[PDB]
DNA sequence: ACTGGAGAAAGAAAGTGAAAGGAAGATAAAACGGGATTCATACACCGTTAAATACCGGTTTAAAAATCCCGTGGCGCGTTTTAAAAAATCTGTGCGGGTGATTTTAT
């Protein structure tokens, strides 16, 4: 599926679901800055499949 | 005395070997984060019941919804900039026969 990410400054980004890290129940995850060109204080606040 | 060639002195410009140092790299120790076990222990599922809550009938009333006039700033259009992505153009490289060349040790 496609994913539309809305940031805190009105920006929009597109990304496939299977490009996200896959982990287990006890893991933590990976920072999202490595996947999208965000700024120093820009956060994702909405997702639309 | 005078002339013109030649050798030697003297002076100025260019090449040189050595120079801190600093950004630019490079290499180890450390702190970190993600799997295999091991249970005791707290959590999931099953019968019982007092109690707390949902629901119906009829008011009401104060609050929110609806309506009209108007005056603006927030979108819309047309025309420029400006990064960003794409297409086009150069740069190396190795295959196998040919031409010609380099270096270090012992006695």
Swiss-Prot record:
Superkingdom of this protein's organism: Bacteria
Ranges in coiled-coil conformation: none
Compartments (UniProt record): Cytoplasm
UniProt remark on domains: An N-terminal fragment (residues 1-523) can be reconstituted with GyrB, but the complex no longer has negative supercoiling or ATP-independent DNA relaxation activities, although it is capable of DNA cleavage; ATP-dependent relaxation is inhibited by novobiocin and non-hydrolyzable ATP analogs. The fragment has ATP-dependent DNA relaxation and 30-fold improved decatenation activities, unlike holoenzyme it preferentially binds supercoiled DNA.
Oligomer status and interactors: Heterotetramer, composed of two GyrA and two GyrB chains. In the heterotetramer, GyrA contains the active site tyrosine that forms a transient covalent intermediate with the DNA, while GyrB binds cofactors and catalyzes ATP hydrolysis. Can form a 2:2 complex with toxin CcdB in which GyrA is inactive; rejuvenation of GyrA(2)CcdB(2) is effected by CcdA.
Role this protein plays: A type II topoisomerase that negatively supercoils closed circular double-stranded (ds) DNA in an ATP-dependent manner to maintain chromosomes in an underwound state. This makes better substrates for topoisomerase IV (ParC and ParE) which is the main enzyme that unlinks newly replicated chromosomes in E.coli. Gyrase catalyzes the interconversion of other topological isomers of dsDNA rings, including catenanes. Relaxes negatively supercoiled DNA in an ATP-independent manner.
Family the UniProt entry places it in: Belongs to the type II topoisomerase GyrA/ParC subunit family.
Further facts: When the enzyme transiently cleaves DNA a phosphotyrosine bond is formed between GyrA and DNA. In the presence of quinolones this intermediate can be trapped and is used as an indicator of drug toxicity. The enzyme-DNA intermediate is also the target of a number of topoisomerase poisons, including toxin CcdB. Few gyrases are as efficient as E.coli at forming negative supercoils. Not all organisms have 2 type II topoisomerases; in organisms with a single type II topoisomerase this enzyme also has to decatenate newly replicated chromosomes.
Protein known as: DNA gyrase subunit A
Organism the protein comes from: Escherichia coli (strain K12)
Full protein: residues contained: 588 to 636 of 875
């Amino acid at each position: 599926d496609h994913i539309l990410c809305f940031s805190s400054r009105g920006r929009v980004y597109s990304m496939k679901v299977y490009q996200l890290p896959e982990a287990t129940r006890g893991a933590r995850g990976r920072p999202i800055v490595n996947l999208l060109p965000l700024e120093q204080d820009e956060r994702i606040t909405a997702i639309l499949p």
